[PDB]
Design a protein around this motif. Structure first.
Motif, PDB file in Angstrom:
ATOM      1  N   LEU A 101       3.747   6.033   3.523  1.00  0.00           N
ATOM      2  CA  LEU A 101       4.095   4.918   4.407  1.00  0.00           C
ATOM      3  C   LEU A 101       5.530   5.266   4.814  1.00  0.00           C
ATOM      4  O   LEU A 101       6.442   5.185   3.975  1.00  0.00           O
ATOM      5  CB  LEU A 101       3.930   3.566   3.715  1.00  0.00           C
ATOM      6  CG  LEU A 101       3.966   2.334   4.631  1.00  0.00           C
ATOM      7  CD1 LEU A 101       3.365   1.130   3.911  1.00  0.00           C
ATOM      8  CD2 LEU A 101       5.385   2.009   5.046  1.00  0.00           C
ATOM      9  N   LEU A 148       0.832  -1.182   0.000  1.00  0.00           N
ATOM     10  CA  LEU A 148       0.000   0.000   0.000  1.00  0.00           C
ATOM     11  C   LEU A 148       0.881   1.250   0.000  1.00  0.00           C
ATOM     12  O   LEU A 148       1.735   1.433   0.875  1.00  0.00           O
ATOM     13  CB  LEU A 148      -0.908   0.030   1.222  1.00  0.00           C
ATOM     14  CG  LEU A 148      -1.675   1.355   1.408  1.00  0.00           C
ATOM     15  CD1 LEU A 148      -2.666   1.580   0.269  1.00  0.00           C
ATOM     16  CD2 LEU A 148      -2.477   1.365   2.710  1.00  0.00           C
ATOM     17  N   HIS A 149       0.704   2.112  -0.981  1.00  0.00           N
ATOM     18  CA  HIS A 149       1.469   3.368  -1.071  1.00  0.00           C
ATOM     19  C   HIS A 149       0.499   4.536  -1.133  1.00  0.00           C
ATOM     20  O   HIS A 149       0.000   4.901  -2.234  1.00  0.00           O
ATOM     21  CB  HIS A 149       2.382   3.382  -2.301  1.00  0.00           C
ATOM     22  CG  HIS A 149       3.169   2.123  -2.495  1.00  0.00           C
ATOM     23  ND1 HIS A 149       4.252   1.775  -1.706  1.00  0.00           N
ATOM     24  CD2 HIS A 149       3.012   1.138  -3.418  1.00  0.00           C
ATOM     25  CE1 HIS A 149       4.715   0.627  -2.141  1.00  0.00           C
ATOM     26  NE2 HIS A 149       3.996   0.205  -3.160  1.00  0.00           N
ATOM     27  N   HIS A 188       8.731   3.454   3.873  1.00  0.00           N
ATOM     28  CA  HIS A 188       9.070   3.468   2.433  1.00  0.00           C
ATOM     29  C   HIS A 188       9.755   4.766   2.030  1.00  0.00           C
ATOM     30  O   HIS A 188      10.790   4.791   1.325  1.00  0.00           O
ATOM     31  CB  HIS A 188       7.809   3.308   1.554  1.00  0.00           C
ATOM     32  CG  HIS A 188       7.250   1.905   1.612  1.00  0.00           C
ATOM     33  ND1 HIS A 188       6.094   1.574   0.914  1.00  0.00           N
ATOM     34  CD2 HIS A 188       7.683   0.799   2.242  1.00  0.00           C
ATOM     35  CE1 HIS A 188       5.847   0.317   1.131  1.00  0.00           C
ATOM     36  NE2 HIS A 188       6.783  -0.208   1.943  1.00  0.00           N
ATOM     37  N   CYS A 235       5.653   8.242  -1.272  1.00  0.00           N
ATOM     38  CA  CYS A 235       4.758   7.414  -0.463  1.00  0.00           C
ATOM     39  C   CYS A 235       4.765   7.886   0.992  1.00  0.00           C
ATOM     40  O   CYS A 235       5.841   8.189   1.543  1.00  0.00           O
ATOM     41  CB  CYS A 235       5.291   5.992  -0.607  1.00  0.00           C
ATOM     42  SG  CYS A 235       4.320   4.863   0.445  1.00  0.00           S
ATOM     43  N   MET A 268      11.618   5.885  -1.317  1.00  0.00           N
ATOM     44  CA  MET A 268      10.431   6.068  -2.188  1.00  0.00           C
ATOM     45  C   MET A 268       9.900   7.512  -2.160  1.00  0.00           C
ATOM     46  O   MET A 268       8.785   7.826  -1.666  1.00  0.00           O
ATOM     47  CB  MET A 268       9.304   5.079  -1.803  1.00  0.00           C
ATOM     48  CG  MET A 268       8.269   4.932  -2.943  1.00  0.00           C
ATOM     49  SD  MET A 268       7.013   3.684  -2.566  1.00  0.00           S
ATOM     50  CE  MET A 268       7.966   2.179  -2.788  1.00  0.00           C
TER      51      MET A 268
HETATM   52 CU   LIG Z   1       4.964   2.863  -0.140  1.00  0.00          CU
END
Ligand SMILES: [Cu+2]
Ligand SMILES: [Cu+2]
Ligand SMILES: [Cu+2]
Ligand SMILES: [Cu+2]
Length: 476
Positions: free
Chosen positions: A461, A401-402, A464, A459, A469
């Motif tokens: 998260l 999930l991003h 990440h 992202c 990311m």
């Molecule tokens: Cu992510």
């Protein structure tokens, strides 16, 4: 014993010198009766709600009293890169930085948090988050619930886990670089399962998912509906009635819920289909807070119309930017294996049916956009100012999930993970779900950002983000 009352962040406005003072520091909090070192803005944990008015400028003086570097980012605020507080916005330990914010966007609930390079997840997990309440001329005329801490209340929902000695147990390691840092303890404005006494009539909740990696799904224990009136970037055109409300990391929604005499109910979060997130006690609906009705009439309204949402413009000829998210397959497989070994099959509940090899194989740069782990020194592209662009963000290639966030704008979702957005997600957003599929957003940047203070896209998260990311981009 009785539940603690829901803590209410102080609502902070400027002084006669038009300044707001924020101190970042470490202190102690108590969870389940055990002390823990925590970090806060103007206190030991979390932060105040900074109140801003469209068309007015304020100056914020930010004093870092930690012993490590930090930054302060205004998530959801459209401001020039120089004051956006991304990774380049370093505040030295023991030092001060001031920023002047020229607010020029509609009323909305935004928030603020650190953006230290490689360390955002730890600094949020340690306690740093605050809120921003933007008002404008239009929203007060609606006569929504407006008594702060009574019928208009912020609800910052976060998970943590703690070690046996009581301390926050944060780690950025191969497992959390793949699936995120998550815990077994849910906090609501820093408290465990508090109660909020609300008057009879409408209660406005300003919901923030402040978790590092856990998605949430709000509902009520007796199935009374929630009326969504606002998303990340402001009011919807009219209320949208929902029975449940998914909220990704860093997103906000404002909802109205009815309060009736003699019938307490909980706000709950329902189990989500995200790896790792349905381990007990999150394998079942989990209380967030108890709403305790008080037999005093609440004066707020739920109007039939809230605001005007402009049509999408023609899409033809607009610049189309591709952002391919990716995770190194080895470190994805190694982190998912460590999750499965630790928790077993329950780490995939609800889902669909060792030597050192050098720095090339370091998980700290294993997550990427367009083939590159975040490079603070090289913005990936230069976006136009004052121009609509179509950004296409793909997570095809992995199934994590991003929640993808873009600084410097409030955008409109055109496709969310391969489908038109739900009605309550069709207005102003700063986050879009990407999970195994492709999203497309319509963005416009009203302010400049140079190489030295670039905007981020990443992202949200946090583990990440911290392991690559993210990209930087300039505007103007
Ligand atoms: Cu992510
Ligand atoms: Cu954020
Ligand atoms: Cu942001
Ligand atoms: Cu960011």
């Amino acid at each position: 014993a009785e539940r603690p009352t829901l803590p209410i962040p102080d609502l902070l406005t400027t002084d006669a010198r038009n300044r707001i003072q924020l101190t970042i520091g470490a202190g102690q909090s108590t969870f389940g009766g055990k002390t823990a070192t925590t970090w806060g803005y103007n206190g030991n944990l979390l932060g105040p709600a900074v109140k801003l008015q469209r068309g007015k400028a304020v100056t914020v003086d930010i004093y870092n009293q930690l012993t490590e570097e930090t930054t302060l980012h205004w998530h959801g605020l459209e401001v020039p890169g120089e004051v956006d507080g991304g990774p380049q916005g370093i505040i030295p330990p023991g030092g001060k930085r001031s920023v002047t914010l020229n607010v020029d966007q509609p009323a909305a609930t935004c928030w603020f948090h650190p953006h230290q390079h490689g360390k955002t997840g730890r600094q949020v997990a340690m306690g740093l988050a605050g809120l921003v309440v933007i008002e404008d001329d239009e929203i007060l005329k609606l006569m929504l619930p407006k008594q702060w801490g009574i019928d208009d209340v912020p609800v910052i929902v976060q998970d943590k886990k703690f070690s046996a000695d009581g301390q926050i147990d944060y780690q950025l390691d191969v497992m959390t670089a793949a699936v995120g840092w998550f815990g077994d303890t849910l906090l609501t404005n820093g408290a465990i399962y508090p109660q909020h006494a609300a008057p009879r009539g409408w209660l406005r909740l300003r919901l923030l998912n402040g978790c590092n990696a856990r998605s949430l799904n709000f509902a009520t224990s007796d199935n009374r509906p929630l009326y969504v009136i606002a998303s990340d970037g402001g009011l919807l055109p009219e209320p949208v009635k929902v029975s449940e409300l998914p909220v990704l990391m860093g997103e906000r929604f404002e909802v109205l819920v009815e309060v009736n005499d003699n019938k307490p109910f909980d706000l709950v979060t329902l189990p989500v289909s995200q790896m790792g997130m349905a381990i007990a006690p999150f394998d079942k609906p989990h209380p967030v807070m108890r709403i305790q009705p008080i037999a005093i009439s609440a004066s707020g309204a739920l109007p039939d119309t809230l605001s005007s949402l402009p049509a999408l413009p023609s899409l033809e000829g607009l610049t189309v930017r591709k952002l391919q998210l990716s995770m190194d397959p080895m470190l994805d497989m190694m982190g998912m294996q460590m999750l499965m070994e630790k928790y077993g099959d329950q780490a995939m509940a609800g889902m669909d049916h060792h030597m050192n090899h050098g720095g090339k194989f370091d998980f700290h740069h294993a997550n990427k956009i367009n083939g590159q782990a975040f490079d603070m020194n090289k913005p990936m592209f230069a976006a136009a100012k004052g121009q609509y662009e179509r950004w296409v963000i793909s997570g095809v290639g992995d199934m994590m999930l991003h929640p993808f966030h873009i600084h410097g704008t409030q955008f409109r979702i055109l496709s969310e993970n391969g489908k038109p957005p739900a009605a309550h997600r069709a207005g102003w957003k700063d986050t879009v779900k990407v999970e195994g599929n492709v999203s497309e957003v319509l963005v416009k940047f009203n302010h400049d950002a140079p190489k030295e203070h670039a905007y981020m896209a990443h992202c949200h998260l946090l583990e990440h983000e911290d392991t690559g990311m993210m990209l930087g981009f300039t505007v103007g």
